[PDB]
Design a protein around this nucleic acid. Structure first.
Length: 216
RNA sequence: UUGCUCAAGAGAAGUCAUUUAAUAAGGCCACUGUUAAACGUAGGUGAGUCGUGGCUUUAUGCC
């Protein structure tokens, strides 16, 4: 019920060819090529693209699919002229961005993260204690829950970094966090958890997305 | 047993051979969608895969 200040969500309407579901490095590299200043930013995160799943491991862009960027509101003039109205290419297809819209950062009792990556922690217990430690670093109190598939197993996801010729394997979990109160909820949403925040992972969304991801 | 009782109009046959509905034609010439305005002030979101790889002190984050 509290709208966070100093942090907004720059949302660009996204359209183009069907896109891989594990975009990650693809989208980040395309934006970096379009926007050189995006590489050197620190407290910025890119939202997972919202669109229905298509065949293979691809993702199809809808009219409701939009590229959303979480950024300090004073740092917008550093990336706005490079992104607003410009076009970026993923592979061989051209994708166009229009004038973005600003969305305030709303507080929620229960927040959700698609994907949390912590270096060197692969098992569930070590991952959970690592996220507890990360909460302790930023002073947030809450209960950690892990998203589960239809079988109840904790969910794992993989991030593919195609740096140079070799391709890289970086993996993490998808958590659901509640019992946060609005102030700490906003603090967690702005700061995020884990690493690879610009890498389409580590950011937090309300728990409606948590249930939606739990569906499929 | 009925002006009745019985009682095949039956056998066979190509409507055939040949013929351009053809020669010619502009839906054409003309048209302003003219003229005027303070944004005043308050309407929201749909979804994967599975056991360390180049930097960085394990840390913890970058590619």
């Amino acid at each position: 019920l509290i709208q966070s200040e100093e942090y907004v969500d720059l949302t660009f309407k996204l359209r183009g060819a069907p896109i891989p579901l594990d975009n990650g490095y693809l989208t980040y590299a395309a934006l970096s090529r379009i926007c050189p200043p995006l590489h050197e930013l620190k407290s910025i995160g890119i939202h997972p693209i919202a669109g229905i799943p298509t065949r293979n491991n691809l993702l199809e862009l809808t009219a409701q699919s939009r590229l959303k960027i979480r950024i300090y509101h004073q740092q917008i003039p550093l990336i706005y002229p490079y992104l607003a109205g410009q076009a970026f290419h993923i592979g061989q297809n051209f994708y166009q961005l229009d004038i973005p819209d600003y969305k305030p950062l709303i507080s929620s009792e229960s927040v959700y993260s698609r994907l949390v990556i912590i270096k060197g922690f692969q098992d569930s217990t070590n991952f959970i204690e690592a996220v507890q430690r990360q909460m302790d670093n930023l002073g947030i109190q809450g209960k950690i829950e892990l998203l589960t598939r239809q079988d109840g197993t904790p969910q794992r996801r993989q991030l593919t970094i195609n740096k140079e010729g070799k391709q890289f394997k970086v993996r993490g979990f998808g958590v659901k966090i509640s019992e946060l109160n609005p102030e700490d909820s906003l603090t967690l949403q702005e700061q995020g958890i884990g690493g690879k925040r610009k890498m389409m992972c580590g950011i937090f969304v309300p728990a409606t997305r948590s249930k939606e991801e739990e569906e499929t």
